[PDB]
Write a protein that binds this ligand. Structure first.
Ligand code: DHC
Ligand code: DHC
Ligand code: DHC
Lengths: 514, 514, 513
């Protein structure tokens, strides 16, 4: 059948991605259902008592000094969704749009948003269906605009996306997915258009993609060592203990596991060799590898620790209530007004992860540059070609393409530093967290393509070095090459690789080498 | 009666865009045809005489040290196209892809590439058709990869694009476009896979778009002055004469022309007034406007001078021969080997223009921020809303979207500074000109969206200030607003504006306010 | 003077105390014992002629050239020589000493082989009032700066006194009572190794950020007191709903700063029940602009970034970033790897630099709002005193703060610019030293922006509450009174440049307590 995620209070990143990707169905746990019903009642009382509350009896933004009569709240909230639907640009992908819906739901599930049962059910239904709202990716300074577009979609006034990205009009979406048109008669529109749902959704997808890409980075580094007689002593556990960064220790351990059983790597500790007068001279190779191999644990590890911080912060954000206003469950006050919608946390972690992805992609790019260079690849054909040299150039074009992709990644920097006072100076500081997460996603995609080129190069290199039978190659290495060869043939003669590179990259983002 | 551009030696940017956009047919002038026939013969002689020439008797890149026998040249060039087809990413748009084809053609037309009559005809046939080759946008370090994909397309081994971007397979493209499959039997493949055609094509489309956007920036700045009682003395010719930057003189002159006939702007020179004792005190307003109006000539002018430099450089590049190797028309030597394919000129000018676009976009974004602020817009409704305040927020969402678009533009910097040694260190410095032109294009697209928002706001602001009849508004101002109102209705009540912003943005990139 | 006893672990505060001269440093007996054991191991490695980088080989790609024992002295002497190609302004006194300390902490772990004399030279330097004069540029991440340090310690390079005044090598040894570094034990690699420079720069950045963060909070609080800010936005309940440690902390510290204040608005707006007669446009909105309302969230994110930076830095500082290294357990004679790759400090420094720029932006916008007569709720334009027009107050300083911020934004992460070098042997490099230095520059700019904001707030408080600061919280009163001891009110326009600079220097080393 299909796995089910029962949402109560806390949901981890894997569960969140399982639901967003459609791998698991979602259900609201009884305790959560009750907390929400209790919050739904508080909203009702707040409205009945005509309490001074943003979005219920006031205008929006700087227009909040304009009080609104209870009789016009329906109109007030309908125009909120209207004026906010100014988004532009390509729509968020299926998984990501759904991750945004999930993020809003999790916040509501905490029981402080006043959302009604019907509203909550509409979000759950979307998540359990095979559809996603079609929402523009640009427009928010960090996430009212993308959420306003979501609302319109759930009302059948906006397009939907199927798993392939093909758009369906509103009516067709509600029909096909058996979704009921969203009804905001309870005046709970602020429960849907609030918080940091978009950036959080984008980031949770980023987190999942990076885990898979990190696994490929490790597996490809290990296979590179098997193709270049790499020295395993640089990956010794003893070295990790001397500089105990968790991410490094993990990188090293994982690299060691990948090459376990290999007869292609050099396992001797050079310091065990005692020299005598006859040894003094110039040896063919230095006793240590170039940094793209020797410092893989340190470079990969730094990135892993950056992703770890990103996930710790993100886990907290995903399970938090980033709504404004909020209705305290204890009933201490009718409502609280603050700024928990300021996505500075996801903005800063996304920018930090973006830099780490660029650094790791640079490592993969240099690993390709080294492997394909006849002066540095220790005996392998130039650019790993097959057939007569000259008449065949092998991966010479693919190698340059990897460099081109990396160069483009570097041209874009952090989004967080570009805060600009807007909204008539009311939002004098903004997080730009959604932009930050989106820029990180683009880099993650470029990293996947660079890793794809490296994987194809390594499949070929392994065969050129060890024969089609991959003699001496580790069990893990053999399994990885064999799996690749199931869909990607050896390069016996030059052929267009662009489509294969793009196809493999898509795979790397969703599955790890095991 | 579809216009025709006759190509001899030189073609200006407007003519180039006329052909690339399909607004004009292209024909090779008699003298050009002869120069090419003569070059074709020279290539034949080089082959006949077994001259040592890159691509005719040698491998590619660092593999050029491998000499090739004449009987293997067909295979040599076939694999060249193959190994280079490693491109990925979204395909270049219809117009840009065709601009690339044109750029290669113009270089060949100089008579130093050795291209055969058939090869040249395939390029001309493509440009006179309604099709464009479908080529990936990423993969070059600056443009063999995108041009190799072009070659495959013209052979019927790659997709094609119709004006709407819908993709057709190779066969369908040759059929629908009534095109002959490309035949490289004359061994003239290097006449197609060479130079800076991609970046040049992208840049020439950028140049055309910026001309139109610049006209909108000027027109909207002028309309803004009519909506805020702007002072025209800051735009006086005398000021331009004191600081003679051509771009500034032009900007000031165009601004004055836009408000000619306006009774909504203040034309009195403040220094003409003589003050008495009873004047000393605090006046309602300062004698000078904020910079977004007062310094428009200086800011817009600097952008215009930047575009001017960009266009002078691009014009030379478009009409140059960026091939390698080349066959001197004067017959001095059989062929010359150098690096005219290094696109550093387009790289640096594209980066400089991108900065200028971001600056001018910032100007527009601040003009929007001021116009919609009730504390700064001198009596206009907050966010230019209509209907009851609070219940309606007008362009409050669109204003923030403008800020978000600008912030994103700022996150990406120059592409040129990221050169990385590649191709086994043979290409130890690369231009990244294609990437630079592409990053500039994205910024131009964001600028158009920001201007679109400003245009919609100004249409509303003009009617709010001067009534639906636009009383006192200049003739130019009236024409612009009326033209907009033909497709974009007033905002009498809040509605989603995303689709309208996008639609208007597309228009602003192709037409100026006239 | 307090003493920091170094055994295995030292925290960031203890490190800065020693680096800044506030505390002496002593090597604990257990550490001296572990180091003596490591010195013996290096001796055995040399006697056994084990194949070890720097002891029997050239350097970098030249490591394939094996070296005879009789030539090792020359070998290591030239290592220091070729590496001394650094250029640019010297690291400041505190930072340079922080670098010396970082190398020592690594050596103290007992895996570097450093001789007792070499260790003593580092300890002596730290206990003296001197710092080696080392150029700030030249490393791709830290052999070059460390090589310069070695030359200084041998009396072949300049020293800096606390004031930054330079002394030649000979004078430095004499004035500091330092003995010339002797590398006869062939332990040169114990000094020219690791991530000492970027780590030293980073720990100084860490200390400065703690102080500036305290000012950022204190000034945000005083801003609320000058603009009738609403405290409900800083309620603990909100923190609990979005439990980011840094945010909860920021909100709690903000509440504490305004405790006892009669100038802030404490009412919870949702308590008010509206009547039909109230419907219309009120003078002010029920919530503050983001520079006040979202301070917990913006400051908080910045604090969590610093917390991550400090966690990673603490590990780096206390680790052995040496290569080669000599296993204390004696499992193998030596290990060859890449623990010198400073990617951790590179990524955290870059991440912190972004956070600093974000928080400086907040401070800059707070100044922009406070000095705007249309937004400061009744305060004079640019907080001027004396006749308006004839006086412009902080109008110039306000623009200066914007210029300082705009400059900060022009510089991005250093880590993304790795370039293959050293004949492609170092095909990837961290650039951590550069990253840490770039972050330091942004920290200095942030200090100046905060200084301008503090001077504006002292003036604004007096204009709003009178010289007696009536209704101002005890913390706010103490802060203004402290500032006023050295910085006079602005009763008439005057040059503020030197005062801004002077105050900024203070903010970096002390918090408002
Ligand atoms: O300060 C706030 O709490 C609201 C800000 C805001 C800013 C722009 C919008 O379009 C909007 O609905 C709300
Ligand atoms: O140095 C040159 O002139 C050739 C460069 C080059 C670099 C990569 C390729 O795939 C290729 O066909 C050519
Ligand atoms: O690979 C290594 O472990 C050493 C690299 C290196 C690179 C440049 C220098 O000047 C030097 O002393 C050492």
């Amino acid at each position: 059948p299909k796995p089910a995620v029962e949402l109560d209070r806390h949901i981890d990143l894997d569960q969140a991605h399982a639901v967003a990707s459609g791998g698991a169905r979602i259900v609201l746990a009884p305790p959560a259902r009750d907390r929400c019903r209790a919050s739904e009642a508080r909203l009702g009382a707040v409205i009945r008592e005509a309490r001074h509350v943003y979005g219920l009896t006031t205008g929006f933004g700087p227009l909040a000094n304009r009080l609104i009569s209870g009789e016009n709240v329906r109109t007030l909230q309908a125009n909120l969704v209207h004026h906010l639907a100014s988004g532009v640009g390509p729509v968020l992908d299926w998984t990501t749009a759904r991750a945004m819906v999930l993020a809003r739901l999790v916040s509501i599930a905490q029981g402080a948003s006043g959302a009604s049962e019907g509203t909550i059910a509409r979000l759950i239904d979307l998540l359990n269906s095979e559809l996603a709202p079609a929402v523009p990716s640009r427009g928010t300074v960090g996430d009212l605009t993308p959420l306003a577009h979501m609302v319109l979609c759930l009302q059948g006034r906006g397009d939907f996306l199927d798993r392939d990205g093909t758009r369906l009009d509103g009516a067709e979406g509600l029909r096909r997915g058996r979704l009921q048109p969203l009804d905001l008669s309870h005046r709970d529109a602020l429960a849907l258009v609030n918080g940091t749902s978009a950036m959080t959704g984008i980031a949770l997808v980023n987190a999942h993609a990076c885990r898979h890409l990190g696994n490929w980075a490790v597996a490809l580094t290990a296979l590179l060592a098997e193709c270049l007689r790499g020295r395993t002593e640089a990956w010794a556990a003893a070295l990790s203990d001397l500089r105990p960064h968790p991410g490094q220790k993990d990188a090293a351990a994982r690299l060691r596991a990948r090459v376990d059983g290999s007869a292609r790597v050099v396992r001797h500790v050079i310091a065990e060799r005692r020299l005598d007068a006859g040894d003094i001279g110039t040896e063919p190779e230095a006793g240590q590898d170039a940094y793209s191999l020797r410092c893989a644990p340190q470079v990969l590890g730094a990135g892993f620790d950056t992703l770890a911080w990103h996930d710790r912060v993100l886990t907290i954000e995903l399970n938090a209530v980033t709504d404004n206003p909020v209705f305290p469950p204890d009933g201490s006050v009718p409502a609280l007004h603050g700024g928990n919608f300021m996505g500075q946390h996801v903005a800063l972690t996304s920018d930090a992860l973006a830099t780490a992805v660029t650094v790791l992609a640079g490592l993969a790019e240099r690993q390709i540059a080294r492997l394909t260079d006849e002066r540095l690849n220790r005996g392998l054909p130039p650019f790993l070609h097959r057939g007569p040299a000259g008449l065949n150039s092998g991966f010479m074009g693919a190698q340059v393409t990897a460099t081109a992709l990396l160069a483009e990644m570097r041209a874009t920097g952090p989004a967080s530093i570009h805060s600009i006072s807007t909204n008539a100076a009311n939002q004098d500081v903004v997080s730009l967290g959604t932009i930050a997460a989106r820029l990180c996603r683009e880099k993650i995609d470029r990293w996947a393509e660079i890793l794809a080129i490296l994987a194809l190069c390594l499949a070929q290199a392994a065969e050129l070095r060890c024969g089609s039978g991959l003699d001496g190659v580790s069990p893990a290495g053999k399994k990885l090459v064999q799996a690749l060869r199931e869909q990607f043939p050896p390069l016996e003669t030059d052929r267009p690789l662009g489509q294969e590179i793009a196809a493999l990259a898509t795979h790397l983002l969703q599955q790890s080498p095991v």
